[PDB]
């Protein structure tokens, strides 16, 4: 079939920019491209139609163009409302298909997570289980990366991350790492480190913690 | 004005099947086709398969074709899709939007919510809520371990939510064919351990409401 390729995930913009998501398909489309946005809360909209151009009941603001395999939307003055997850599609061939999409987020200043890490709460350890949680909160871009170094080193078996879409009020993002092991395997070992990774330096942002001193 | 309410989520177990609906109003039924999109996390939408009202004629995409049948309702205006002998790659989100024409070649002007599907076969089970708190400067960050519960969903608060600003509740993740989820606030240093600070994790599913105080030392 024809694979329909949307470079850039992400887009950051500042509102009141104008705004430019492409889309390029795999072959010549004869101009039946679609464009539909996604809001956070799921719904599905139809933008733009027919490479771009044809409009439905949409703002001035959005724009479209394209032909044969490379097409794009531009949203001329971007707007709160307008942030949100852009896909385009081509009608030309069966199956129907679609680009990965791309999702628009706000501008800020770069800005180093707050990083924290948890021993396991007694609670939890009655059970047998231990569990060491780390957070790195309120930090741009949203690309980063965690590391947990069991008495000193490796530990990948365990980890399991989960991310925040950009927070409303600042632009910040925040991700939260949890290490879980056995009762009897955290009491075999000592310093648990949860290590941050963040362009917003090239030192990582190390926080970690002994047993032996609890 | 043109509406398309889909059947709410449902669970099923891996193996079985299931039919969800979609129903057209506003507009005239049998004219205009019903297509079905796929959405995984892993983005991207998928197109399932388009179906034409008025006469039955469906056409599917291979790849769902077998195990996928879209049938309809031309009474009620309502449009079902049914999926068998579920898998867990069929765990998603399922849209249905009308077809429509300008220029040789179709696009979906209108769409529904989306209905959602899980497939699993864990049962209605309360999570244990762990506290988070720092062991033996100005501003504090605590929280607290929702783990081992399903399914989705469960809702935190901070102090019955008199904590709002600098809290983040995080996505939740499939352990053990379990959910697990964490909570963080952050409180100056002076308002913990002076007060109270208690996560408030309610699990409807398993009617459970837990409130857990985030107390000093490990």
């Known amino acids: 079939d024809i694979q329909m390729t949307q470079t850039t995930s992400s887009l950051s913009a500042s509102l009141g920019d104008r705004v430019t998501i492409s889309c390029r398909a795999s072959?010549?489309?004869?101009?039946?491209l679609n464009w539909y946005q996604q809001k956070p809360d799921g719904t599905v909209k139809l933008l733009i139609y027919?490479?771009?151009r044809l409009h439905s009941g949409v703002p001035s603001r959005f724009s479209g163009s394209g032909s044969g395999t490379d097409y794009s939307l531009t949203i001329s003055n971007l707007e709160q409302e307008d942030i949100a997850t852009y896909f385009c599609?081509?009608?030309?061939?069966?199956?129907?298909?679609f680009g990965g999409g791309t999702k628009l987020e706000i501008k800020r200043a770069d800005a180093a997570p707050t990083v924290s890490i948890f021993p396991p709460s007694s609670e939890q350890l009655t059970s047998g289980g231990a569990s060491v949680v780390c957070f790195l909160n309120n930090f741009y871009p949203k690309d980063i990366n965690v590391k947990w170094k069991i008495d000193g080193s490796e530990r990948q078996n365990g980890v399991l991350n989960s991310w925040t879409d950009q927070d409303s009020k600042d632009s910040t993002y925040s991700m939260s790492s949890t290490l879980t092991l056995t009762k009897d395997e955290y009491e075999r070992h000592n310093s648990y480190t949860c290590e941050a990774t963040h362009k917003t330096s090239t030192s990582p942002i190390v926080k970690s913690f002994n047993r032996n001193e609890c | 004005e043109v509406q398309l309410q889909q059947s709410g989520a449902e669970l099923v177990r891996a193996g079985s099947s299931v039919k969800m609906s979609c129903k057209a109003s506003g507009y005239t039924f049998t004219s205009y086709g019903i297509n079905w999109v796929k959405q995984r996390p892993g983005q991207g939408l998928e197109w399932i398969g388009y179906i034409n009202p008025g006469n039955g004629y469906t056409k599917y995409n291979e790849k769902f074709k077998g195990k996928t049948t879209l049938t309809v309702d031309k009474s009620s205006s309502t449009a079902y899709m049914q999926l068998r002998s579920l898998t867990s790659e069929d765990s998603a989100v399922y849209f249905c939007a009308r077809s429509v024409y300008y220029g040789g070649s179709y696009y979906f002007d209108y769409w529904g919510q989306g209905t959602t599907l899980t497939v699993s076969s864990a049962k209605t089970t309360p999570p244990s809520v762990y506290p988070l708190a720092p062991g033996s400067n100005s501003m504090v960050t605590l929280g607290c371990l929702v783990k081992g519960y399903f399914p989705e969903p469960v809702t935190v608060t901070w102090n019955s939510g008199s904590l709002s600003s600098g809290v983040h509740t995080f996505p939740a993740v499939l352990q053990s064919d379990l959910y697990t989820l964490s909570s963080s606030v952050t409180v100056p240093s002076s308002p913990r351990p002076s007060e109270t600070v208690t996560c408030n994790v309610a699990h409807p599913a398993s009617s459970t409401k837990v409130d857990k105080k985030i107390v000093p030392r490990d």
């Open positions: 072959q010549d489309i004869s101009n039946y």
């Open positions: 599609q081509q009608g030309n061939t069966l199956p129907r298909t």
């Open positions: 027919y490479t771009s």
